[PDB]
Short mmCIF file of all heavy atoms in Angstrom, two decimals:
data_model
loop_
_atom_site.label_atom_id
_atom_site.label_comp_id
_atom_site.label_asym_id
_atom_site.label_seq_id
_atom_site.Cartn_x
_atom_site.Cartn_y
_atom_site.Cartn_z
N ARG D 161 -18.66 24.73 -45.53
CA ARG D 161 -18.69 24.30 -44.10
C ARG D 161 -19.97 24.74 -43.43
O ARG D 161 -20.31 25.94 -43.40
CB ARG D 161 -17.46 24.76 -43.30
CG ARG D 161 -16.23 23.90 -43.50
CD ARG D 161 -15.65 24.03 -44.92
NE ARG D 161 -15.02 25.38 -45.06
CZ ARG D 161 -14.79 26.08 -46.15
NH1 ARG D 161 -15.20 25.60 -47.32
NH2 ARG D 161 -14.19 27.22 -46.07
N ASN D 203 -14.92 30.54 -37.37
CA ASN D 203 -14.03 31.45 -38.13
C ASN D 203 -12.79 30.72 -38.69
O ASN D 203 -12.30 31.02 -39.72
CB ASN D 203 -13.57 32.65 -37.30
CG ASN D 203 -14.65 33.67 -37.13
OD1 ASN D 203 -15.55 33.79 -37.96
ND2 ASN D 203 -14.53 34.46 -36.05
N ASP D 204 -12.19 29.82 -37.88
CA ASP D 204 -11.08 29.04 -38.34
C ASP D 204 -11.50 28.24 -39.62
O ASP D 204 -10.64 28.03 -40.49
CB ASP D 204 -10.55 28.12 -37.33
CG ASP D 204 -9.21 27.47 -37.72
OD1 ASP D 204 -8.17 28.16 -37.64
OD2 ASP D 204 -9.23 26.23 -38.10
N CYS D 205 -12.75 27.83 -39.76
CA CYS D 205 -13.14 27.03 -40.88
C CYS D 205 -14.00 27.82 -41.89
O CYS D 205 -14.44 27.23 -42.89
CB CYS D 205 -13.89 25.81 -40.40
SG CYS D 205 -15.61 26.14 -39.92
N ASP D 206 -14.29 29.09 -41.63
CA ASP D 206 -15.05 30.00 -42.52
C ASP D 206 -16.44 29.43 -42.87
O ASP D 206 -16.81 29.36 -44.01
CB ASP D 206 -14.25 30.41 -43.78
CG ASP D 206 -12.98 31.26 -43.60
OD1 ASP D 206 -13.09 32.31 -42.95
OD2 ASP D 206 -11.92 30.86 -44.04
N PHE D 504 -7.20 21.63 -40.47
CA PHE D 504 -7.70 22.55 -41.46
C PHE D 504 -6.91 23.90 -41.43
O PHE D 504 -6.81 24.53 -40.40
CB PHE D 504 -9.19 22.72 -41.19
CG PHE D 504 -9.87 23.54 -42.28
CD1 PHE D 504 -10.40 22.86 -43.37
CD2 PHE D 504 -9.98 24.94 -42.21
CE1 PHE D 504 -11.04 23.62 -44.41
CE2 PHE D 504 -10.62 25.64 -43.17
CZ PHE D 504 -11.15 24.99 -44.28
N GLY D 505 -6.46 24.34 -42.63
CA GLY D 505 -5.79 25.60 -42.82
C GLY D 505 -4.40 25.56 -42.30
O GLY D 505 -3.71 26.60 -42.21
K1 K J 2 -9.27 31.19 -43.12
#
Side-chain angles (χ1 to χ4, degrees):
Chain D
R161 278 71 70 202
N203 285 333
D204 191 76
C205 77
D206 295 305
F504 189 89

